[PDB]
Amino acid sequence: SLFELGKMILQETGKNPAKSYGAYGCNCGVLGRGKPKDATDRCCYVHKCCYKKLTGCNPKKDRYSYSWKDKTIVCGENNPCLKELCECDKAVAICLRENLGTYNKLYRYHLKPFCKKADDC
Amino acid sequence: SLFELGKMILQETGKNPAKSYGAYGCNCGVLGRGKPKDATDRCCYVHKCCYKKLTGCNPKKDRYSYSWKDKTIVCGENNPCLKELCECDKAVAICLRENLGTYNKLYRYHLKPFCKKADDC
């Protein structure tokens, strides 16, 4: 669920998740996907496509279990969908940390409705 | 949808809904409910309890018709759920506006895991 996602983002990036990613670019936060503005936005784009591809569970609602072993998100879910879900979230949190280097505050509160439509996942 | 909600909050409060309320307190924005930090937070608490009472429609994704007439949100929507949805969003927008005077920026981007669990609606 977003509860685990939020935690992972904190774990990976050390940044407040909503402040930095609750509304950033065309893809981070609500209002679905759009053409990514930058690498960070691309994380969120990929993340949303990851969610979309999940057939067997609800990515935003469904809670799952994961661990923090050697400063690494470890998805210990036996439930296949929750496992794929956890891996979706892990991947975006890692992506977000890896792209902090080009994170641009001007993309915070980017006007999403005016984003170019996104190519399908 | 978050579009109509965002716009109502904007019309009522005059604030960017995403920045001011996308993550405020334990109730505004993502991650369900929690013990409200203040009146503004309480609005979102009530709002989420309002959403719970809805009868099938999707508050996140479903669009509905309202008009801003004589500076009042009018839920012209006739469909039963979308009408109540609209009414939920109108109520929170008004509530946020009415409690603007105690809006506390410190609760912007409040970390949701730090919140005491919400009482049942």
Swiss-Prot record, chains A, B:
- Please name every pair of cysteines joined by a disulfide bond in this record: C26-C115, C28-C44, C43-C95, C49-C121, C50-C88, C57-C81, C75-C86
The protein's site described by Cationic membrane-docking site (MDoS) is found at: K112, K117
Expression by tissue: Expressed by the venom gland.
Q: Which GO terms describe its molecular function?
A: calcium ion binding; calcium-dependent phospholipase A2 activity; phospholipid binding; toxin activity
Write down the position(s) of the site called Hydrophobic membrane-disruption site (MDiS). Answer: L111, F114
Q: Disulfide bond: is it a keyword of this entry? A: yes
Q: Subunit structure, per the record?
A: Homodimer; non-covalently linked.
Instruction: Identify its protein family.
Output: Belongs to the phospholipase A2 family. Group II subfamily. K49 sub-subfamily.
- Record's protein name: Basic phospholipase A2 homolog piratoxin-1
Q: Which organism is it from?
A: Bothrops pirajai
Q: What is the lineage of its organism?
A: Eukaryota, Metazoa, Chordata, Craniata, Vertebrata
